[PDB]
PDB file of C-alpha atoms and ligand atoms in Angstrom:
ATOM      1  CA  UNK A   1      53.986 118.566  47.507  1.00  0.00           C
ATOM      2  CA  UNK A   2      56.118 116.457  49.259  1.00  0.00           C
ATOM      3  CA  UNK A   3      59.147 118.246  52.011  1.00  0.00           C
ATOM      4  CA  UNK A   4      62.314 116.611  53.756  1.00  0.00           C
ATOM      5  CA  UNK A   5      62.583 117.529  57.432  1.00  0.00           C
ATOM      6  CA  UNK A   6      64.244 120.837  57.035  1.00  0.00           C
ATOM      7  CA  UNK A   7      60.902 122.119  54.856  1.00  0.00           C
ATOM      8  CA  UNK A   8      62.858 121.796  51.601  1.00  0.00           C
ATOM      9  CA  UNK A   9      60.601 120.890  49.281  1.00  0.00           C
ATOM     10  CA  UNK A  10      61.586 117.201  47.483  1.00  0.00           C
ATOM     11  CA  UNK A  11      62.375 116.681  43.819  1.00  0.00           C
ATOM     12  CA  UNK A  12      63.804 114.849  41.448  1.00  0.00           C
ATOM     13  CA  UNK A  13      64.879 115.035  37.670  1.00  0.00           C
ATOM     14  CA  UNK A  14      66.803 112.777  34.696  1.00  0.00           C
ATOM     15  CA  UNK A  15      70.205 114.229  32.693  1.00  0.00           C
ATOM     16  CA  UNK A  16      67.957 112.497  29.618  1.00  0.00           C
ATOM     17  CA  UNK A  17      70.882 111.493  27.151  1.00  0.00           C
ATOM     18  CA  UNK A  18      70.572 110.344  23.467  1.00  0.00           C
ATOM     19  CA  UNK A  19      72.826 107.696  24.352  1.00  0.00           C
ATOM     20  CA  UNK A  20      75.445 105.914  26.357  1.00  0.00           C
ATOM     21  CA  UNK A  21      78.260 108.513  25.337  1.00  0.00           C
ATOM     22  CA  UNK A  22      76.455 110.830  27.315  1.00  0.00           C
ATOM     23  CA  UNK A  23      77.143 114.066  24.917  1.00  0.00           C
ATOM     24  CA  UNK A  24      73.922 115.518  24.099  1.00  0.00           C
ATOM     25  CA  UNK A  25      71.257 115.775  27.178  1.00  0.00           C
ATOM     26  CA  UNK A  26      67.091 117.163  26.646  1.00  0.00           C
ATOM     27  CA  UNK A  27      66.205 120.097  28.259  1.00  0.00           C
ATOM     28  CA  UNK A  28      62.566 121.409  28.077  1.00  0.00           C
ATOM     29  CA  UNK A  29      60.823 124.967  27.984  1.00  0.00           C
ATOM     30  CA  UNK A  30      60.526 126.983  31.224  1.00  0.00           C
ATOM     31  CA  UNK A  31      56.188 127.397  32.140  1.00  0.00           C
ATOM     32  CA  UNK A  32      56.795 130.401  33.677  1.00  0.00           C
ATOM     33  CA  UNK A  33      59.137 131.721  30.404  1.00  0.00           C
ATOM     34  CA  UNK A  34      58.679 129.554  27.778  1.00  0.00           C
ATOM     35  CA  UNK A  35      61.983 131.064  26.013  1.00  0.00           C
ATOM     36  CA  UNK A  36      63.981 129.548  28.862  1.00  0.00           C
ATOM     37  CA  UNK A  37      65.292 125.785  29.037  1.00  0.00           C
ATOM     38  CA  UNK A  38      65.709 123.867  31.852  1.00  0.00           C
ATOM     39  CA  UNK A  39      66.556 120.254  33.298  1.00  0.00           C
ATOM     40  CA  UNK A  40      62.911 118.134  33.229  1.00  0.00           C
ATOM     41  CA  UNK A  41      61.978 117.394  36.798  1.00  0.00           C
ATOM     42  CA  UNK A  42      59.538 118.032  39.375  1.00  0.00           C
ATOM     43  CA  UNK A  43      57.845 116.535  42.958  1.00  0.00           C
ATOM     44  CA  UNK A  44      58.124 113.894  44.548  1.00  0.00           C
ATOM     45  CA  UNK A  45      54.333 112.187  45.872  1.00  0.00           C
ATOM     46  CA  UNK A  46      53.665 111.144  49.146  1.00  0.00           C
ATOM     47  CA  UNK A  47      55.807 107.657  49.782  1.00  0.00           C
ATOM     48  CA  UNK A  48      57.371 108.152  46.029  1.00  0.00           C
ATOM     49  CA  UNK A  49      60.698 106.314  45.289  1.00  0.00           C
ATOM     50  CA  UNK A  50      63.022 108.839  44.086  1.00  0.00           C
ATOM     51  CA  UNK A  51      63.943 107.208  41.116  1.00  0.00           C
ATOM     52  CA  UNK A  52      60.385 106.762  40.541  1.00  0.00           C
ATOM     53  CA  UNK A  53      59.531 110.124  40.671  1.00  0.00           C
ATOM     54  CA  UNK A  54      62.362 110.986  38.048  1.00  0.00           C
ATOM     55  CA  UNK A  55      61.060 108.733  35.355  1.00  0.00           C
ATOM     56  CA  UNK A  56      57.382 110.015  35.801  1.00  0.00           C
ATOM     57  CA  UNK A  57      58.536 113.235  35.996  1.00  0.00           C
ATOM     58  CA  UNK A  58      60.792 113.357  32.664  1.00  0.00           C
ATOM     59  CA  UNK A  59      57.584 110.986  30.818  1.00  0.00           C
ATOM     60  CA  UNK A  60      55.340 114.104  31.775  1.00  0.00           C
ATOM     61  CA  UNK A  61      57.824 117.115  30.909  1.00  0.00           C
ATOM     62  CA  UNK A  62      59.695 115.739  28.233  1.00  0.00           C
ATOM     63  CA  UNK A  63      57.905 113.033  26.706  1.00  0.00           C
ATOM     64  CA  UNK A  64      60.472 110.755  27.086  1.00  0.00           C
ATOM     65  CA  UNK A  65      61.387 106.795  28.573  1.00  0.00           C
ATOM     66  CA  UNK A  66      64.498 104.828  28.351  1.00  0.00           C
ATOM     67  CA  UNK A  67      66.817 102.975  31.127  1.00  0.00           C
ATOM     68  CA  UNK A  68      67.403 104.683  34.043  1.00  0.00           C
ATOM     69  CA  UNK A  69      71.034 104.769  35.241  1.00  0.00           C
ATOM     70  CA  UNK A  70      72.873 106.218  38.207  1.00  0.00           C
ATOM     71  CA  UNK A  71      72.352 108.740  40.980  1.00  0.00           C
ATOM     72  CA  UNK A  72      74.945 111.843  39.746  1.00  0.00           C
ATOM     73  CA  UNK A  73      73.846 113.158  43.591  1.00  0.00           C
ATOM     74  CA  UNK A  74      71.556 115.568  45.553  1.00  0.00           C
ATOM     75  CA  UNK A  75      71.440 119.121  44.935  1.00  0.00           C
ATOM     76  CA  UNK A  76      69.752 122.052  46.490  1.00  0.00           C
ATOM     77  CA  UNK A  77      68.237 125.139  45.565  1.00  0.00           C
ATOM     78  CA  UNK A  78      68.830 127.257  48.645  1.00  0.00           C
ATOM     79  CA  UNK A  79      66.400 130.558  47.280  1.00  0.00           C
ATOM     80  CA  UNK A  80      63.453 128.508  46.514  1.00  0.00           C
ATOM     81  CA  UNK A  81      64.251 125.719  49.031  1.00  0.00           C
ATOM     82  CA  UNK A  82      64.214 122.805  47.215  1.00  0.00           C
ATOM     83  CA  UNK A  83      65.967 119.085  47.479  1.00  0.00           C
ATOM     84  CA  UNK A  84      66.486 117.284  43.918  1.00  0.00           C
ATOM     85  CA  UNK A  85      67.805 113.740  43.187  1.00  0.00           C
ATOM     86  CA  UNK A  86      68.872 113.768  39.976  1.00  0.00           C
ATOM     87  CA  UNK A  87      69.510 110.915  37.956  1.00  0.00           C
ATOM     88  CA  UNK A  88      70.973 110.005  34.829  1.00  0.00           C
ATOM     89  CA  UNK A  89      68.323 108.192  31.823  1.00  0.00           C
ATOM     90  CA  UNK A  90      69.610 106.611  28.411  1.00  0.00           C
ATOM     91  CA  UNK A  91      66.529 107.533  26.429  1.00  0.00           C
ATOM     92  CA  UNK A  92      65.336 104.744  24.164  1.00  0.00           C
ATOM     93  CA  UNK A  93      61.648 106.372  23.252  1.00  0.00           C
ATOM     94  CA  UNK A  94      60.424 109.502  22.189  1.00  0.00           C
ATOM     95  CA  UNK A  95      56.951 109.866  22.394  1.00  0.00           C
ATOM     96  CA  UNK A  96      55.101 112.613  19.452  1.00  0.00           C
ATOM     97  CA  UNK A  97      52.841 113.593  22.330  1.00  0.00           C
ATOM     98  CA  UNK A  98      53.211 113.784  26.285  1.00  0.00           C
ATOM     99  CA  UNK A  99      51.045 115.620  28.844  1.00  0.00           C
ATOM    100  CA  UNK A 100      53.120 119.317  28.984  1.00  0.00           C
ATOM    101  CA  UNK A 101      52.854 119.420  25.354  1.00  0.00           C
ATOM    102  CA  UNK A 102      49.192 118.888  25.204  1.00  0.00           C
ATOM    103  CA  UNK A 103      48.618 120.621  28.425  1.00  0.00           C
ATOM    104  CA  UNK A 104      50.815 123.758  28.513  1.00  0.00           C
ATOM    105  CA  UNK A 105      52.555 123.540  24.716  1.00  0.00           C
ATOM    106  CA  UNK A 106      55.874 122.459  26.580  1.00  0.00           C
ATOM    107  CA  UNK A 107      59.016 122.192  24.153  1.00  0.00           C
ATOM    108  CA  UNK A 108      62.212 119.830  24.216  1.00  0.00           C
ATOM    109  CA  UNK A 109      65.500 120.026  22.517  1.00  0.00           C
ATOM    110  CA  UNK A 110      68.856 118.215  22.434  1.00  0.00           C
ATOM    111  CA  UNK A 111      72.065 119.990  23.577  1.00  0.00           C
ATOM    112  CA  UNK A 112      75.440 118.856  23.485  1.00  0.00           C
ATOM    113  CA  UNK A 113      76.143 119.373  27.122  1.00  0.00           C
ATOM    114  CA  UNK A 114      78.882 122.373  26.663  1.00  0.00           C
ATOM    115  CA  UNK A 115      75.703 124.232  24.869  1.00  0.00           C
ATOM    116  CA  UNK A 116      72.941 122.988  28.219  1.00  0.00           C
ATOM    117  CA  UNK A 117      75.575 124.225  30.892  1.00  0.00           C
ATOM    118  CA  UNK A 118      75.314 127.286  28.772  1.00  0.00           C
ATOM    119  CA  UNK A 119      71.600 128.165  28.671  1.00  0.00           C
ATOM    120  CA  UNK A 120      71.321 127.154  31.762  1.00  0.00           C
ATOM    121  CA  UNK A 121      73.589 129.422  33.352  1.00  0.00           C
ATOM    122  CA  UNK A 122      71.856 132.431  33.842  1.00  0.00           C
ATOM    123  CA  UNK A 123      68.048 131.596  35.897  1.00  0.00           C
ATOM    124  CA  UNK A 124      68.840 127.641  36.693  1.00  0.00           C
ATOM    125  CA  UNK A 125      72.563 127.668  37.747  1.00  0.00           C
ATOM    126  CA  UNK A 126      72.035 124.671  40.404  1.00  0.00           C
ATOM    127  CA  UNK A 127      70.912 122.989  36.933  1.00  0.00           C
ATOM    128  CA  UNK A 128      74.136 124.024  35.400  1.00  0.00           C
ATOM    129  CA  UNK A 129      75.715 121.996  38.024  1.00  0.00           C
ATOM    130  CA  UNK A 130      74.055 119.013  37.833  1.00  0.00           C
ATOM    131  CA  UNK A 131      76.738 118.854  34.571  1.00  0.00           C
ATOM    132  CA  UNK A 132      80.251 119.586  36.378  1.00  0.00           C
ATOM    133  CA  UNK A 133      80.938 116.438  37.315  1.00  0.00           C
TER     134      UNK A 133
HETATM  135  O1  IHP B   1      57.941 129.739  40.716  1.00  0.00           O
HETATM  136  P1  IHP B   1      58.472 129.648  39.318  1.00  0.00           P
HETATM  137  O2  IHP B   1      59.743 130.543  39.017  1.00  0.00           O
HETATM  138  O3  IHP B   1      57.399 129.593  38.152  1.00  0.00           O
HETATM  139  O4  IHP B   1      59.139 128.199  39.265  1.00  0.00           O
HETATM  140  C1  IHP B   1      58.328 127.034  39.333  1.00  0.00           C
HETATM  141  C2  IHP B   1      58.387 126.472  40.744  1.00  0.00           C
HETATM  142  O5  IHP B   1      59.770 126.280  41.113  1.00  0.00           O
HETATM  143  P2  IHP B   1      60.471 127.057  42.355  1.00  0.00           P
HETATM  144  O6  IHP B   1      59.980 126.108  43.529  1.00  0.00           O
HETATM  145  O7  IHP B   1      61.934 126.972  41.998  1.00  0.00           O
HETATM  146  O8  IHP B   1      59.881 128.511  42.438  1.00  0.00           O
HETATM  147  C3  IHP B   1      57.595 125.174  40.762  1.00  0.00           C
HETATM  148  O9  IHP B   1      57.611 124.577  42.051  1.00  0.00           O
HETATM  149  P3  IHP B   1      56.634 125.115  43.214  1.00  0.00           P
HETATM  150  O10 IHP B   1      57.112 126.472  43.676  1.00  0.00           O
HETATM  151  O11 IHP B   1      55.262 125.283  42.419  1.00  0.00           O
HETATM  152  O12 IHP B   1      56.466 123.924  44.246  1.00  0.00           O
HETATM  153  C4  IHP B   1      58.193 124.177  39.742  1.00  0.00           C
HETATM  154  O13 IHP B   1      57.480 122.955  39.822  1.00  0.00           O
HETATM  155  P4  IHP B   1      58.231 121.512  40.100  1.00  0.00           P
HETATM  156  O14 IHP B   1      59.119 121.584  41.353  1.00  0.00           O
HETATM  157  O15 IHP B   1      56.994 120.548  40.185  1.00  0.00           O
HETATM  158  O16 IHP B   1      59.095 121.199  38.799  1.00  0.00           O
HETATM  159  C5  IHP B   1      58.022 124.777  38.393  1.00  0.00           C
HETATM  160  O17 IHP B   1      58.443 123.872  37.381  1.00  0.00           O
HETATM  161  P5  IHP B   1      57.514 123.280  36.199  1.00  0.00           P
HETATM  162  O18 IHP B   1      56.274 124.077  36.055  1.00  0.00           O
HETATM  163  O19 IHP B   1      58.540 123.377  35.004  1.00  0.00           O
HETATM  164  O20 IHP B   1      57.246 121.778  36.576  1.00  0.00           O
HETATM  165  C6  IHP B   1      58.866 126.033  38.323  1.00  0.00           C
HETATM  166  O21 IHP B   1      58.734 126.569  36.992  1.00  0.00           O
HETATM  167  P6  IHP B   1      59.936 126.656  35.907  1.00  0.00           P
HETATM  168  O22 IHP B   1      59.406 125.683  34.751  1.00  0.00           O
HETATM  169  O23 IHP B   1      59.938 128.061  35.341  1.00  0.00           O
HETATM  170  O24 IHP B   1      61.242 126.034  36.495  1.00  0.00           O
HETATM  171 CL1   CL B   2      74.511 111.100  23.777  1.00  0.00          CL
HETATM  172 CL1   CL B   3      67.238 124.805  40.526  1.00  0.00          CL
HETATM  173 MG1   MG B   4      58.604 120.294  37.022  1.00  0.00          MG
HETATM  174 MG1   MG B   5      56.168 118.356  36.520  1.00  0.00          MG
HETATM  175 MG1   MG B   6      55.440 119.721  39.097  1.00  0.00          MG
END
């Protein structure tokens, strides 16, 4: 684990869209609760680009590559102290199996982003936000 200067741990995650119209995004199954979706994402390693650390991190949780686009910002989590860059990704490859799934049993699905803002909502609403903009 990786922290900025005020002890907030650092993170960072894609919006993983089908496509350029950005209109449906893939969120993937809570560990903790597997009946809960959120935004792929996770730590950043020691001297880690953050957009680095967004591409690995979706490729591991989601199973996913494509082209990495821009910055939507920086957003924190102020209960579990936590710093994420998240990014937006244009996924061109969908791979059958990824580490989570073998690992853990992870799960993805597409949402139109109306229906992600939704189950996000209730446990993830910093994730909710990523969306407003
Ligand atoms: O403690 P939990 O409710 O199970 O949540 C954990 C925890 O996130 P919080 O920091 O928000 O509590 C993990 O981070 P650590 O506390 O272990 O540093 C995080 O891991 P990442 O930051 O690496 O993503 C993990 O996420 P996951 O296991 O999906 O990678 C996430 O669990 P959730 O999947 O339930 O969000
Ligand atoms: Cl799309
Ligand atoms: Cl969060
Ligand atoms: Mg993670
Ligand atoms: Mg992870
Ligand atoms: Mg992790």
């Amino acid at each position: 684990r990786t922290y900025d200067g005020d002890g907030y741990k650092k993170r960072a995650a894609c919006l993983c869209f089908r496509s350029e119209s950005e209109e449906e995004v893939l969120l993937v199954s809570s560990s903790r609760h597997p009946d809960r979706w959120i935004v792929p994402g996770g730590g950043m390693e020691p001297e880690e680009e953050p957009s680095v650390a967004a591409v690995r991190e979706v490729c591991e949780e989601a199973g996913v590559k494509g082209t990495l686009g821009r910055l939507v910002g920086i957003f924190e989590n102020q209960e579990r102290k936590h710093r994420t860059y998240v990014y937006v990704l244009i996924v061109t490859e969908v791979l059958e199996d990824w580490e989570d799934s073998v690992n853990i049993g992870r799960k993805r699905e597409w949402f139109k982003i109306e229906d992600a803002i939704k189950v996000l909502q209730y446990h993830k609403p910093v994730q909710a936000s990523y969306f407003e903009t």
